[PDB]
Symmetry: D2
Subunit: 124 residues, 4 copies
Amino acid sequence: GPAEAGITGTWSDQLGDTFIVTAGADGALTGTYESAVGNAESRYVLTGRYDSAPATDGSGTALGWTVAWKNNSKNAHSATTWSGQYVGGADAKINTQWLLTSGTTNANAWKSTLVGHDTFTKVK
Amino acid sequence: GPAEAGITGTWSDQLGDTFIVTAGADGALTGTYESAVGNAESRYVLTGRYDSAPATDGSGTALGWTVAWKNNSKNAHSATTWSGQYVGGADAKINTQWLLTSGTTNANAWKSTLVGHDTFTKV
Amino acid sequence: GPAEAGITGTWSDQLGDTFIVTAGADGALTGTYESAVGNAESRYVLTGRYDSAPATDGSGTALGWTVAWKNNSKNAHSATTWSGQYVGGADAKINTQWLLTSGTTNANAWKSTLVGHDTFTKV
Amino acid sequence: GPAEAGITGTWSDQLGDTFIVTAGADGALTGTYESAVGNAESRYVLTGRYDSAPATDGSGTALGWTVAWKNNSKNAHSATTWSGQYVGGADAKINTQWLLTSGTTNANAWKSTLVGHDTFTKVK
Ligand SMILES: O=C(O)CCCC[C@@H]1SC[C@@H]2NC(=O)N[C@@H]21
Ligand SMILES: O=C(O)CCCC[C@@H]1SC[C@@H]2NC(=O)N[C@@H]21
Ligand SMILES: O=C(O)CCCC[C@@H]1SC[C@@H]2NC(=O)N[C@@H]21
Ligand SMILES: O=C(O)CCCC[C@@H]1SC[C@@H]2NC(=O)N[C@@H]21
């Protein structure tokens, strides 16, 4: 439906974090992600899931994805998930909230996870 | 590293939410998840990532995964991500926080996302 | 410091959720909040805290507050906390993330807490 | 009702973070809080709100509170809110999720906020 093609493409946010994704008819999200901030260099594997038959009543399309911050260049020992919804239209948006967990000892687990939000806009 | 075999298997929480996962040598998590609560029936595909070369200093292994709540039986128009860490050993744990976003109209978007936390133990 | 007069006043977000606050010289926030959405009518008491001696290095001023959604008109059996920072200047902002917990039975507690975010600008 | 007296008293969690609170008939929570972890020393002022007429159907009592991490001994330039519900009974609990925001420059705001959860049990 329009959400598969709508989500597929390149996205970025206002900090210049950016990702390339394909949304499949099987509900899969597959791509790579590049953060402009934090302990990250170059691109990381992204995988996730989305609702391939969203409500047709004006609602967004729910989705989520994960990046573990390890690639051939760098390993931050952390992983981020983004949970949110795709809102289509000519200026499509992906609106998300995210959790960034770092590996820690049990004693430091209380400070293991950052939370934030981010809206991405489609490049093409 | 040990996290590969250690994450691979079947996990559950106190409510009987459960999942089967394989942690690949490449950092992929793939499996199936079943919720005991919510607008959910039977199993849903899970996919995520973990740090396949975690620190060796006693820290946990970071990971995350997603489930979109649509399968052959039901579609709740929602998706959950779990972000957390695997803590190994013979009674291994995966400690998570989670975000459950439901598709909403823009007017309702302020109430789209629930947050919670959950500890799974290996079956 | 400037945060005292700068936080004190009336604030609103894009939806018309609004609050009046006084930031005390002692670190207290006290005021009243009105939501344009949700199970809410008229004004509710707000109370919180802010760092009354923030860093001087250009950082924002940390703060937080709570509203329990019971007043003379309505009781939604819920409470929201906002955690964030005040960024001063002539177009000052309060940038927040928030947690809205509803009273639930233990069985439903996994769905008790919504999460979101909101930026307020000063009227 | 039972929730006012139920919440009033001293609470602690498994790390030995602890607080003393009074829940008022006016919906107020007033007290002080002592963290066993992080950039904190001795006690900090706590203020918050709770539902003074909770549902009588088995539901918990919603509540929340704030601590800014500045006292006469220490200033961490941060503040934490806890949002959750009081569950009464002979072994009463306060179950919460929390957000800890540090003051940051706008550039570092994406890493300003930690998230976690915590269950407190009543001391007396
Ligand atoms: O520092 C790390 O642990 C690895 C990089 C984390 C970057 C975070 S993930 C949430 C936010 N969104 C971005 O694209 N970058 C930051
Ligand atoms: O109700 C829905 O929208 C779909 C089911 C959601 C179930 C949630 S996901 C977070 C928590 N953990 C579980 O295993 N189940 C609930
Ligand atoms: O529906 C309820 O349980 C009470 C009203 C909640 C309104 C929420 S609080 C977070 C967000 N910000 C607002 O100003 N309103 C919504
Ligand atoms: O380091 C700081 O910025 C000040 C202390 C923060 C302590 C946090 S607040 C959430 C968690 N619960 C606790 O009682 N202590 C930690």
